[PDB]
Amino acid sequence: GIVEQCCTSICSLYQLENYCN
Amino acid sequence: FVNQHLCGSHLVEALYLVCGERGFFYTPKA
Ligand SMILES: Cc1cccc(O)c1
Numbered sequence: 001g002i003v004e005q006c007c008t009s010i011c012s013l014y015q016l017e018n019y020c021n
Numbered sequence: 022f023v024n025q026h027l028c029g030s031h032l033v034e035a036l037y038l039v040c041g042e043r044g045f046f047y048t049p050k051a
Binding site for chain 2: 001002003006007011013016017019020021
């Protein structure tokens, strides 16, 4: 769901950090 | 589904700048 989470509505840098290693 | 295709190109780029030295794995799913 990265895509469903971020392509349907905008993601913040901060939600983005969660897909980091 | 060139649309998700367009979108993940920009997402991996935001991820590259956000994860920095840590990396990230990019799954087009789950
Ligand atoms: C930073 C960024 C890139 C592409 C899509 C988004 O929801 C967010």
